[PDB]
Design an enzyme around this catalytic site. Structure first.
Site, short mmCIF file in Angstrom:
data_model
loop_
_atom_site.label_atom_id
_atom_site.label_comp_id
_atom_site.label_asym_id
_atom_site.label_seq_id
_atom_site.Cartn_x
_atom_site.Cartn_y
_atom_site.Cartn_z
N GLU A 62 43.83 29.80 37.85
CA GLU A 62 43.21 30.78 39.18
C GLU A 62 44.35 31.67 38.94
OE1 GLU A 62 42.89 27.06 38.62
OE2 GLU A 62 42.47 26.30 40.10
N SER A 87 37.85 22.06 38.89
CA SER A 87 37.79 22.14 40.23
C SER A 87 39.24 22.34 40.36
CB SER A 87 36.92 20.98 40.84
OG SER A 87 36.93 20.74 41.95
N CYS A 92 45.46 26.31 44.49
CA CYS A 92 44.27 27.76 43.99
C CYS A 92 43.21 27.73 44.60
CB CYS A 92 43.88 27.14 42.20
SG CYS A 92 44.98 27.38 41.25
O1 HPY Z 1 46.00 25.13 35.67
C1 HPY Z 1 45.24 24.30 37.03
N1 HPY Z 1 45.97 23.47 37.75
C2 HPY Z 1 45.48 22.40 37.86
C3 HPY Z 1 44.27 22.57 38.70
C4 HPY Z 1 43.46 23.87 38.87
O2 HPY Z 1 43.24 23.84 40.02
N2 HPY Z 1 44.22 24.71 37.24
ZN ZN Z 2 45.79 25.17 40.51
#
Ligand code: HPY
Ligand code: ZN
Ligand code: HPY
Ligand code: CA
Ligand code: CA
Ligand code: ZN
EC number: 3.5.4.1
Lengths: 156, 161
Positions: A62, A87, A92
């Site tokens: 994200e 999720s 994020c």
């Molecule tokens: O790249 C990620 N790692 C773990 C969770 C999620 O926010 N995205």
């Molecule tokens: Zn993340």
């Protein structure tokens, strides 16, 4: 939306999944994202987790997606959707909240879910969980084969 | 947040941590960036895991707030490494940086000031079980007030407004 899917959501999740698959092939964590302007459907940016690729502690899917969009006027984000194949973790989640991105469309929350999914709702965002089996399978593969790398990616 | 929240105790490393965070903020300011700096310190031995400052203008970055740049500069770490650290930040963290602290389980955050900016994150850190100390550092307040005064639209961009 009223819970109606957006006309752009299929496109967003497909791009996120493409990014997750690309990151998988690069030897990283298979988590992808994209940010779409709800007004016109324009893809503002797309990205995937770069922990392994770049030795990065902060480029979750994200975050990388947002980085790849570049600097933007704050108002732009207020009518976007962030698509993420997984999720969002608390980091994020926080990014989505900070920028006021009103919708977060999530591939799946079976392999991982943080308190962020609900915190987004507390903070007034719409969260959509698609339960996309493509996303679930690739992420499950990664966790099965590289559990300690996965744990690192979520700070455990 | 809760009525029963209270600010954490001082640590022997806070002067060191805030002085490094401030030097990072001042360096970023000189580079033409947002003057927000940070460092991550091990609470047991005072060692500095990493330090950084906001790189929005330097790198065209929508994510490298001071706290995020600090964590990036610490590199990949086992989760356990974060669990008895303090993140020093010259400015009270936005919701994004708050989320990073929470995700990694960095149990303590020392904040230079929250006069120029404060998000829901400062209290949410406490809700989520993290210690927060606000030191009200005048150097930090001065340099951030100057940036907001001189470049308001750049500041608004940095906080998504
Ligand atoms: O790249 C990620 N790692 C773990 C969770 C999620 O926010 N995205
Ligand atoms: Zn993340
Ligand atoms: O670099 C930063 N910008 C804004 C707020 C704080 O989280 N840090
Ligand atoms: Ca491990
Ligand atoms: Ca305590
Ligand atoms: Zn921040």
């Amino acid at each position: 939306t009223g819970g109606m899917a957006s006309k752009w959501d299929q496109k967003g999740m497909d791009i996120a999944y493409e990014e997750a698959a690309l990151g998988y092939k690069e030897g990283g964590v298979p988590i992808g994202g994209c940010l779409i302007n709800n007004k016109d459907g324009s893809v503002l940016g797309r990205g995937h987790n770069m922990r392994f690729q770049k030795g990065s502690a902060t480029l979750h899917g994200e975050i990388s997606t947002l980085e790849n969009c570049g600097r933007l006027e704050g108002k732009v984000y207020k009518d976007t959707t962030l698509y993420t194949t997984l999720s969002p973790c608390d980091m994020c989640t926080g990014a989505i909240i900070m920028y006021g991105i009103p919708r977060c469309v999530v591939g799946e929350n079976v392999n991982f879910k943080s308190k962020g999914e609900k915190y987004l709702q507390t903070r007034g965002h719409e969260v959509v969980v698609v339960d996309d089996e493509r996303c679930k399978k690739i992420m499950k593969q990664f966790i099965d084969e590289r559990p300690q790398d996965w744990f690192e990616d979520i700070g455990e």
